[PDB]
Amino acid sequence: MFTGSIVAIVTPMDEKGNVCRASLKKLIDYHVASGTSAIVSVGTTGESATLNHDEHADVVMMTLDLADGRIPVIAGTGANATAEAISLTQRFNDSGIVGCLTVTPYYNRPSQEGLYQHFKAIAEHTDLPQILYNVPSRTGCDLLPETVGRLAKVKNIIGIKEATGNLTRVNQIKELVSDDFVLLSGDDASALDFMQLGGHGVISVTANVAARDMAQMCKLAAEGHFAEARVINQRLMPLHNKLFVEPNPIPVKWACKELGLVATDTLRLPMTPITDSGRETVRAALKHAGLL
Amino acid sequence: MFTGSIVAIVTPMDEKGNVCRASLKKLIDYHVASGTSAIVSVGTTGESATLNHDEHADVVMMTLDLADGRIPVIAGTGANATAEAISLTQRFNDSGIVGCLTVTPYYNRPSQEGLYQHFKAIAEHTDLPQILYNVPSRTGCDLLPETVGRLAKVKNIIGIKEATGNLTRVNQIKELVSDDFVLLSGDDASALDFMQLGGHGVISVTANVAARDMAQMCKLAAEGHFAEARVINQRLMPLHNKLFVEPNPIPVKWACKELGLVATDTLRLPMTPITDSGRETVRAALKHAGLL
Amino acid sequence: MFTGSIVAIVTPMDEKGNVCRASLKKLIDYHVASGTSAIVSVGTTGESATLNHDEHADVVMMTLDLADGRIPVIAGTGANATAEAISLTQRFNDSGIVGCLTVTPYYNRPSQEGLYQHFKAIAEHTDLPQILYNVPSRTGCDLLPETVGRLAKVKNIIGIKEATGNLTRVNQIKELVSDDFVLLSGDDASALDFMQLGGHGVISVTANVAARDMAQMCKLAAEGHFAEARVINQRLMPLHNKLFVEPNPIPVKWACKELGLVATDTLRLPMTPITDSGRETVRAALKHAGLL
Amino acid sequence: MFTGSIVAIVTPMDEKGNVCRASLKKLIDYHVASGTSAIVSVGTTGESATLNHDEHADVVMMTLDLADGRIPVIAGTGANATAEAISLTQRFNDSGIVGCLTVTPYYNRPSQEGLYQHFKAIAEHTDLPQILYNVPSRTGCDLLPETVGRLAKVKNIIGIKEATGNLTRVNQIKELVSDDFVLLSGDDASALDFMQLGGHGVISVTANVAARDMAQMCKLAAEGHFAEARVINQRLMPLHNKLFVEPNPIPVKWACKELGLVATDTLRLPMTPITDSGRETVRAALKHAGLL
Numbered sequence A, B, C, D: 001m002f003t004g005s006i007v008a009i010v011t012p013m014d015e016k017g018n019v020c021r022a023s024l025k026k027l028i029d030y031h032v033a034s035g036t037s038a039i040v041s042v043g044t045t046g047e048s049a050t051l052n053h054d055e056h057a058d059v060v061m062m063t064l065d066l067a068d069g070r071i072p073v074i075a076g077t078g079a080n081a082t083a084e085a086i087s088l089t090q091r092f093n094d095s096g097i098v099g100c101l102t103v104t105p106y107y108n109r110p111s112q113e114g115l116y117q118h119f120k121a122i123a124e125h126t127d128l129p130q131i132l133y134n135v136p137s138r139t140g141c142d143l144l145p146e147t148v149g150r151l152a153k154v155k156n157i158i159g160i161k162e163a164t165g166n167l168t169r170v171n172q173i174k175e176l177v178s179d180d181f182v183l184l185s186g187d188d189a190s191a192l193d194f195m196q197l198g199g200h201g202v203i204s205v206t207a208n209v210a211a212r213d214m215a216q217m218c219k220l221a222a223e224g225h226f227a228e229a230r231v232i233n234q235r236l237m238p239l240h241n242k243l244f245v246e247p248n249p250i251p252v253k254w255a256c257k258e259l260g261l262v263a264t265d266t267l268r269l270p271m272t273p274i275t276d277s278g279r280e281t282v283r284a285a286l287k288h289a290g291l292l
């Protein structure tokens, strides 16, 4: 499933930075019960950078196992080296995942032609649906609509997580692609506007802690009931912003701990513990959302 | 040492994308002959992103072997996961490399506290000198002077490659650190300016193909002969700019090939071959520098 | 009238840079016939900067006279000095204009409090409806939604021309103001997206030469027929962009001359004649729109 | 002359917002006493925007009178309409002012060709020396080095106030113009750096309240005593920054008042009185500089 509220799920960790199966199970049961459309496993919010390839694969396989067919799972498979991306994708072929979320290469700043060749190569060697992922603030490069248009002609490149927050991209891309290409926001604070302009859903950080409201908001949006969706959005907006008061996923992991959804808010370096000022800001945003 | 013209050396590859020893040997001999002060092995220009950890170490060890004590070798050791950075650093402990060049984590956007803890942890697991590396356009993260000041208090954190091209950083950092902390430009087009403001050298892409000019320019700068150095800078300025006409190291590898310095200009995806327009642009810049 | 397609009308000039009454009449008759909602007289596209206060007032009074009650006229009354703005407004009190369009002070970069006091003062000394105008790329300052919210409580501050192209501003402002506050795009290329998000119209440069299509597009948008409006938008999009290939109003004046709507494309310094390359680009955009 | 510490002088006003001669006289005497090299009258810090043309000329003539040949006076003559700039310039022809400071047109965003024609036209209507002024953050327009080079070929275009804070401009412009073209900083925080790179002085806001320190710092810089000059710069750096804590000249006028240099800190709308938090911030900065 590639519409509605899709959770960019945290990788819950114990005090030693190892994946906490009990906490992960609780999260997955929570999303099943709360109407989340799908789970993105080991994406940006899942600390993809600080898990090695084996750990990365373990978390995805564990998420699939715990999901037990009750909610679709999309694997984070992005890499800044084309060989690494292909290799990661091969690990998940025939795993039970429904799709892959694959970010533009970061740090090395490839050309648009390089992005084309990167994603074409990755798509060539799997039958899995591929969701492209653009987030220039993180990567140093910007996958432009023209190139998204080219890539969409590849059979199994079926959508994009557009995280710029630049809302003009919705219809610039939509115009260049077929009607079944999925446009998904990757920016919680502008996600409702993104849907109102033609987007089909959101891959959301806020959904980790406001799953039901996010699910309802996205359904109302899909139905054209924007004023109704916007009331929900207004109560989530502090959360949409303040979950980034310190680097994601620091705030959202702390929020999950505070709600009792995970056992510890531990991360891996270079992420560090939430500051006291950060706790207060996030707590206030949670209360505004009606969650505490 | 950590002064003068330091080359950000390409990793020359054969048509299959593997390191070409003959070409690497030719490059290192050229830098020895040219007066290059040191070599950064498997930095950004050396395609650190698309070499796996073992391949990366092999290239560094090969470069060190081929240098044969004639020219100091600095290993690229940056990673966006602290555990990976430590592991990479540990490979070169007691190896013969004189220091490490280590980039702020990319993609995951750590806070300034995260940068502090990341670089501190790394420095603690080695006796090797550490040169911090800031390049926000690639990483999505900006290591600020205040934090550089904090880190410079760690015994073996001894310098910074400052690639912002924001020249106010030179004196902002200099006032926060001791006189023996090295300030190196990571931006060829502004490097002479950077030196004129008190910088000690440059980790250069241009030096790959104009090693003798670059070495001489940095010498003049160190001696305070800025007008003289500027004449060289002006001859080199088209290269400083046009070596980024397409994503580095696509242009510089082609230039190396054109100059007969390497056998092939092959790269690894997502870097792709230089365009015809790029070739013509880079060739004109080489002609302007009097290298062709 | 403060909804639909509102034309940011050119001030047509003879070869000596003086207002050309015959050309102005032709433009005004064209907008009456073509379904334009209203005319903004001596706004940005009308060369407000290079008309002295007397010339400025003359053009507005002439536009009113030629309009002869067939189409509403809004006066550009913006100034970067509060006294100048008030004084300009007093000239038009009881003139027959329906409203004023008043830009944030430019060059002097006032605070949000200064913007508040500026616009409050101006509104205090007229009964005329006031439309605020935000265009940071021109002015060096940015009227934020919070301050728009404050100002909207002033009886006769009734809307905003939001020209950032930042589409998040639509609902950030809408949430803070009453349901009858008018939100108008000041960015042709993003104007349809702006309306789709809740905006009520556009103060348009493109409307100078594609009046009928703009009128229909905005009506379809107001009716919720976005896919239909978007077909029209796609054929105007080259024009939306290329009317800014050289500084506005250089391209649009040339376009009006080429269509026979005005006698000469003359401007005042510091605007200068369109380049040959500019003519070709604009001509191609006109043909794409079906206008030549 | 057009060298050293040049004050961007405030236009001190009485409570009614009109120029206060006694305060202006006190300021000019202070600059004479302090070693300030020249005064810019009714530049940006002098509230050029909110003085009408006659009021502006009166302030310039008053300043010139009060200077009484003891200190050179440069008139602010910029305008965004070329005809206005010429007219303002013509007021000071054969007056005793030694030159004009003329800003790129603001708001209307002319092309580089428009800048060329605007400044050329102005220079042609005067014998007075012309200092170009680039400050894109206020104007929406950026006068590039190439165009500065073009204009420097005009006999009486003799310098630039470069307020971008982008230090690469110093040597980019210097290589395009003759050795007697003056390079002046318009950015206090980076001005010493600007001078260290080859700039000849600064048109300073800080100099309003720290005239003696600024003059001495620029003298040391001109003599190549940069380390010595930096000690002064560091004492002044909080002022360099915090005089922009609220929009200039709100902070500097309050500082003048606090120091007893002017009778009131009154400004004209849209500038508004300093906030209490602003006062405390500016006072700490003055204390740091040892002026309080």
Ligand SMILES: N[C@@H](CCCC[NH3+])C(=O)O
Pocket (backbone or CB within 6 Å): A048, A049, A050, A051, A052, A053, A056, A079, A080, B080, B081, B084, B107
């Ligand atoms: N830290 C590296 C390797 C990731 C390993 C798989 N999750 C990166 O962010 O690309």
Ligand SMILES: N[C@@H](CCCC[NH3+])C(=O)O
Pocket (backbone or CB within 6 Å): A082, A083, A084, A086, A087, B268, B269
């Ligand atoms: N970058 C490699 C990818 C091969 C796939 C290996 N897992 C190439 O050029 O073919």
Ligand SMILES: N[C@@H](CCCC[NH3+])C(=O)O
Pocket (backbone or CB within 6 Å): A080, A081, A084, A107, B048, B049, B050, B051, B052, B053, B056, B079, B080
């Ligand atoms: N592609 C990964 C791993 C690099 C491995 C060592 N060169 C990264 O850029 O972080």
Ligand SMILES: N[C@@H](CCCC[NH3+])C(=O)O
Pocket (backbone or CB within 6 Å): C048, C049, C050, C051, C052, C053, C056, C079, C080, D080, D081, D084, D107
């Ligand atoms: N050129 C000045 C005066 C405008 C006179 C009235 N249109 C400005 O742009 O503010």
Ligand SMILES: N[C@@H](CCCC[NH3+])C(=O)O
Pocket (backbone or CB within 6 Å): C082, C083, C084, C086, C087, D268, D269
């Ligand atoms: N800026 C003036 C405006 C007065 C209106 C004169 N036309 C003030 O503070 O009152």
Ligand SMILES: N[C@@H](CCCC[NH3+])C(=O)O
Pocket (backbone or CB within 6 Å): C080, C081, C084, C107, D048, D049, D050, D051, D052, D053, D056, D079, D080
């Ligand atoms: N406020 C107008 C006119 C200034 C008149 C002379 N000081 C402007 O800033 O252009």
Ligand SMILES: [Cl-]
Pocket (backbone or CB within 6 Å): A008, A040, A043, A044, A045, A076, A101, A203
């Ligand atoms: Cl994700």
Ligand SMILES: [Cl-]
Pocket (backbone or CB within 6 Å): B008, B040, B042, B043, B044, B045, B076, B101, B203
């Ligand atoms: Cl490097």
Ligand SMILES: [Cl-]
Pocket (backbone or CB within 6 Å): C008, C040, C043, C044, C045, C076, C101, C203
């Ligand atoms: Cl307008």
Ligand SMILES: [Cl-]
Pocket (backbone or CB within 6 Å): D008, D040, D042, D043, D044, D045, D076, D101, D203
């Ligand atoms: Cl000034």
Ligand SMILES: [K+]
Pocket (backbone or CB within 6 Å): A151, A152, A153, A154, A155, A156, A157, A158
């Ligand atoms: K497809």
Ligand SMILES: [K+]
Pocket (backbone or CB within 6 Å): B151, B152, B153, B154, B155, B156, B157, B158
């Ligand atoms: K140290």
Ligand SMILES: [K+]
Pocket (backbone or CB within 6 Å): C151, C152, C153, C154, C155, C156, C157, C158
């Ligand atoms: K109102």
Ligand SMILES: [K+]
Pocket (backbone or CB within 6 Å): D151, D152, D153, D154, D155, D156, D157, D158
């Ligand atoms: K000259």
